[PDB]
Structure 1
Amino acid sequence: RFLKVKNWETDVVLTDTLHLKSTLETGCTEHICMGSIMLPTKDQLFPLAKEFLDQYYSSIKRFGSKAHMDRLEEVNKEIESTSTYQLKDTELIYGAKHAWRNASRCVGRIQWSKLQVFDARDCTTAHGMFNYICNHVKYATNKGNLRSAITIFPQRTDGKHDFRVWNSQLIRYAGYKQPDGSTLGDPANVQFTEICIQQGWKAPRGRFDVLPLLLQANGNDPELFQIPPELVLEVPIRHPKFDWFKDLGLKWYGLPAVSNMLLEIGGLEFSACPFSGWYMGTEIGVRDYCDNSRYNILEEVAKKMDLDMRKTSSLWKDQALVEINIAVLYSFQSDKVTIVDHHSATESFIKHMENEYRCRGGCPADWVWIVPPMSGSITPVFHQEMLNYRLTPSFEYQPDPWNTHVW
């Protein structure tokens, strides 16, 4: 019931108790571990609200005070009469920060308390949503000195009036299948790019076309907005030694901003809650560039490097991988756009885990997502046992809107 996690590199053992407050389920049972699976009414809401308000009032050292009792009282009143309730600003901010704190898959959580929360609960149209998002983009971008931020649109009501950003991230590149049979741009966004076209977007048909927003206000049909080109900071990718690298014509955007997830706070559901931080280099260099179903550039880079591609055992893929990743980091740093390397980020997370064990009694972590996609065992997180469990407030995955929406 009280659980140990060991670091195998340093022998440091931590004791986890925080898991006993876990509310949601994992996917796993005593018979099967699902740790590597990507995706494993009035009555229900009152308990959820209470659980949340209890933790909030505890956090501000006023647990069981008159102000605590009065608020629980007031929310109970409100649910009974209205069937939902509204969070105080203070609660909303607490909820959002804690949803990030509880993100078991996020290596960057050392930062979690420095989160700029934009309350867009007064938003009523898609045009207002576009306005909110442009402001989030410009604030978070901060001319390259990135600042963490979330923009929180109105909560779900009867579920027929959902706000949704149809995009998966605020900024992403279009994918188009070719007569050639191949794929131009990012293969991950073909379906969403077609949707956009279908609704009327005129696509430039290049390899790195920033997609438009498709925004859904109040359960309405989504509409299209181009983010002002000048708000989208991009970085040309060059290598500090290989002059030919720039000739590949690679670029990536500075701002990673997740926009398809659901924020749950005290039982309330915020279905449009775009959030953003800054990149760890491997995200772009390893995943976006090298995944076979992504820009899949390994083969071209290796050839330009004149490596032996006759046999897997020359480790030509591995060699090219490191260089691509050196180039990503070098380009971002040269243009003064915030980026973190995987050594620095994982080191930060081990420190954050120590902190969270010490001050909170644990830190849910998902080892499968936390360990970087290159050079695993040379980062400290590889050797750190992690317990994965689900706390609330949280961010949750939700179905892609085009499968839900009725037009």
Structure 2
Amino acid sequence: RFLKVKNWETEVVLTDTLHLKSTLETGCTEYICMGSIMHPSATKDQLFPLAKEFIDQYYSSIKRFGSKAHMERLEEVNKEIDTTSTYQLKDTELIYGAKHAWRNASRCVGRIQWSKLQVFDARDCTTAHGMFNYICNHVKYATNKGNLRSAITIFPQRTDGKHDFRVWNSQLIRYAGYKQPDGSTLGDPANVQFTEICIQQGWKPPRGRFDVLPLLLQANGNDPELFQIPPELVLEVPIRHPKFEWFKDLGLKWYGLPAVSNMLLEIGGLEFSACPFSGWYMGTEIGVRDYCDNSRYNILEEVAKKMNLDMRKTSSLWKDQALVEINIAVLYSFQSDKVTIVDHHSATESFIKHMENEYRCRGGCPADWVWIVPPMSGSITPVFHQEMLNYRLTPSFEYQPDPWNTHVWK
């Protein structure tokens, strides 16, 4: 049945019909909502209807549903699943599938850009060296000297589960984290375990606060191999503040390119376990979560100190004030270095415009309020006031197990 969503600030009401096309589970039931749970919980027989569904919607998108080309594609695919227990996507299908996995990503506030995605087909890759070459090309292309461009690189699909392609890095570019003797942590605390795996694998750590991690790449189920991304390919931004002259002295920097490399791309029942994708940052991703999460860089105290704020009571809101200044700094630094970045006001504004576009042309837009609303100043952004329906459309990006839990070494 048709569902309505209201914006409580503008009184705009949209009608969702698109949800009628979803299949696999949200995690919720009529009795229990799991909207804030981060991760809720093939064969020839399972494969064809999934392939059929996908081919059907592809040919429906290019206005040739039921065509001879459509009819023959279905036959070709069925015949191929028959003999090889799988099938291969056409290039046009791969590109359509990747764009729509982004289009369907309910947790992404950046989806107004969804159809401008550069798709790199790396399905001919066979070795970690080949993966490294492809990933370098991606990074170089996507960075584009600061004028960032959205991109995805797609490695060979899963076959028997024993020969998976995986990027072991959760993101292509991240800073190392080190467990110090005294008990504290140097670098990025989120990456302490992964940093230790790289060290355990032969990586010589500079033990700095912003050491770019090496790539750990697994091809065709083999042991992963270490690679250093060439430093000229890694664009970084020193963080400074437009008024606080002392801010530069904090010694902070971040990288310009956000590139998720641990997710799984599902298209027509096919599983692409290595599909690193990248866009550009929303300022709060760095300024709020990376720098101010207690379990991350945790710099609020220091900043509030230099701001000489009253830090004895919570109700002075010293944390909130230091937080805003940090996020001003990040946006100012990127903009000053002409590195693409978006603030949470502009991004959420664009997302409301996108939703309206999608309801008009597509009959809806799956969206996860819990992730869409920014981690600071929530209700002064327009998505706070926007009701959203969340549901799962395919093609899609999914979570998968960390490779160091599933991999049986040499």
Same-fold status (TM-score > 0.5) = yes
Kindly state the Cα deviation for residue 23 of structure 1 after the two structures are TM-superposed.
1.4
CA deviations on 1:271-313 (whole Å, 9 max, x unpaired) are 0000000000000000000000000000000000000001111
Identity %: 98
- Residue 264 of structure 1 aligns to a residue in which SS? strand
Query: The residue matched to 1:118 in structure 2 has which SS?
Result: strand
What secondary structure does 2:359 align onto? helix
Q: 1:246-285, aligned counterparts within 5 Å?
A: 246-285=248-287
- Alignment partners' CA distance in 1, 2:28 and 2:212: 39
State the SS of the aligned residue for 1:293: coil
Query: Can you list the C-alpha shifts for 1:10-42, whole angstroms capped at 9, x where unaligned?
Result: 010000010010011011001110000110111
**How many angstroms does 1:155 deviate by?**
0.3
Shift of 1:221: 0.4
In 1, the alpha carbon distance for the partners of 2:23 and 2:110 equals 23
For 2:17 and 2:30, the matched residues in 1 are separated by 20
Long gaps (5+) in structure 2: none
Q: Secondary structure at the match of 1:246?
A: helix
SS of 2:302 mapped into structure 1: helix
In the TM superposition, residue 164 of structure 1 has moved relative to its aligned partner by 0.1
State the secondary structure of the residue aligned to 1:146: coil
Deviation beyond 2 Å, 4+ runs, structure 1? none
Separation in 2 of the partners of 1:82 and 1:133? 29
Secondary structure class of the residue paired with 2:266:
strand
Report how far residue 241 of structure 1 moved.
0.1
Equivalenced residue count is 407
Q: In the alignment, which residue of structure 2 is the partner of 1:219?
A: 221
Between the aligned partners of 2:83 and 2:319, the Cα distance in structure 1 is: 62
Is residue 126 of structure 1 aligned with residue 128 of structure 2? yes
- SS in structure 2 of the partner of residue 134 of structure 1: helix
CA deviations over 1:123-170 (Å, ceiling 9, x no partner): 010000000000000000000000000000000000100000000000
Equivalent residue runs for 1:8-407 within 5 Å? 8-40=8-40, 41-407=43-409
Give the SS at the match of 1:286. helix
1:162-197: CA deviation from partner (whole Å, max 9, x where unpaired): 000000000000001101110000000000000000
User: Shift of residue 359 of structure 1?
Assistant: 0.2
TM-align CA RMSD = 0.4
Shift of 1:5: 0.3
Q: Quick one: distance in 2 between partners of 1:48 and 1:210?
A: 40
C-alpha separation between the residues in 2 aligned to 1:290 and 1:242? 18
Give the Cα separation in 2 of the matches to 1:199 and 1:221: 10
Q: Distance in 2 between matches of 1:333 and 1:403?
A: 40
Deviation string 1:74-107 (CA, Å, 9 cap, x unpaired) is: 1001001111000000000000000000000000
Distance (whole Å) between structure 2 residues aligned to residue 309 and residue 109 of structure 1: 39
- 1:333-354 deviation per Cα after TM superposition (whole angstroms, max 9, x unaligned): 0000000000000000000000
Deviation of the 1:8 alpha carbon: 0.2
Unmatched tracts of structure 1, length 5 or more: none
SS at match of 2:65: coil
Distance in 2 (alpha carbons) for counterparts of 1:262 and 1:81: 25
1:364-403 deviation per Cα after TM superposition (whole angstroms, max 9, x unaligned): 0000000000000000000000000000000001111000
Q: Aligned equivalents of 2:162 and 2:322: distance in 1?
A: 49
SS of aligned partner of 1:52 = helix
- What SS is found at the alignment partner of 1:24? coil
SS at match of 2:254: strand
SS of match in other structure, 1:141: helix
Measure how far apart 1:72 and its partner are. Answer: 0.4
CA distance in structure 1 between the aligned counterparts of 2:24 and 2:348, rounded to whole angstroms: 26
How much does 1:261 deviate?
0.2
Q: Distance in 2 between matches of 1:23 and 1:241?
A: 52
2 CA distance for matches of 1:251 and 1:67? 52
